[PDB]
Design a binder for this molecule. Structure first.
Ligand code: 426
Length: 245
């Protein structure tokens, strides 16, 4: 996260920290995810496409720091790794950048909801917030684009939604941004998600209920003028999510 505020997991109980073991033992942080149900997490396909081996991934819920064990956390493994069978990656735009990870503890059980391990609801068919609506993104991604280390503590910021036609103007993303993606950014471009936050939860309070409206997908640079953060429009992939669960 660029700008924003530091925070603890108790404020984002649906945030999943996904790391991956490397040949040799060392483990690094990959992307963030969202707890769909006790047994399922939903992320982005571009965080796994190049390393499709489910065994390599580790996932935590209720973890507040990057290299600390938060009281209340749970360490999981990826029972099933499902990548959208129609995904592709152009110069900037990432297509059908949505994946699923069926989790499982060493004992074989799924996630046990708690004060710091809860779920977020999927949006309903044909019902997304209007443009200009404030929403929030969470993650352990970069604080600045010139850095190389991820922040040690969890962060989060609030951004606004940008309409499809406004996002397709030339100085933005032209015909690269399609209708199965949502744009969102700070009107003053001082804060924005960034590398590290990919596949992060984009929660928007719609008509009263906190909703998972988008997954962090792509953007030009980070917090740059006329360069909104693009996300996957979850409402569209509802039939897909249903049949693959
Ligand atoms: N501006 C944002 N809000 C934002 C939001 C998301 C961002 C993601 C990456 C990034 O580096 N993503 C990434 C990481 C690993 C691989 C990858 O692409 C592969 C998938 C298909 C071809 C190579 C992208 C970089 C910058 C990002 C910036």
């Amino acid at each position: 996260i660029i700008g924003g505020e530091f925070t603890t997991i108790e404020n984002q109980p649906w945030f999943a920290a996904i790391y991956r073991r490397h040949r040799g033992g060392s483990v690094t942080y990959v992307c963030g995810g969202s707890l769909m149900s006790p047994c399922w997490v939903i992320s982005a396909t571009h965080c796994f496409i190049d390393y499709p081996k489910k065994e390599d991934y580790i996932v935590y819920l209720g973890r507040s720091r990057l290299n600390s064990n938060t009281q209340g956390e749970m360490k999981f493994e990826v029972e099933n790794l499902i990548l959208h069978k129609d995904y592709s990656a152009d110069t900037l735009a990432h297509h059908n950048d949505i994946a699923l990870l069926k989790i499982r503890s060493k004992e074989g059980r799924c996630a046990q909801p708690s004060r710091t391990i809860q779920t977020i609801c999927l949006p309903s068919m044909y019902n997304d917030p209007q443009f200009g609506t404030s929403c929030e993104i969470t993650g352990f991604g970069k604080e600045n684009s010139t850095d190389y280390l991820y922040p040690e503590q969890l962060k989060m910021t609030v951004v606004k939604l940008i309409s499809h036609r406004e996002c397709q103007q030339p100085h933005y993303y032209g015909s690269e941004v399609t209708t199965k993606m949502l744009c969102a950014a700070d009107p003053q471009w001082k804060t924005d998600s960034c590398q590290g936050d990919s596949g992060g939860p984009l929660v928007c309070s719609l008509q009263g209920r906190m909703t998972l409206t988008g997954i962090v997908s792509w953007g030009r640079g980070c917090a740059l003028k006329d360069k909104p953060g693009v996300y996957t429009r979850v409402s569209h992939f509802l039939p897909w999510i249903r049949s693959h669960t």
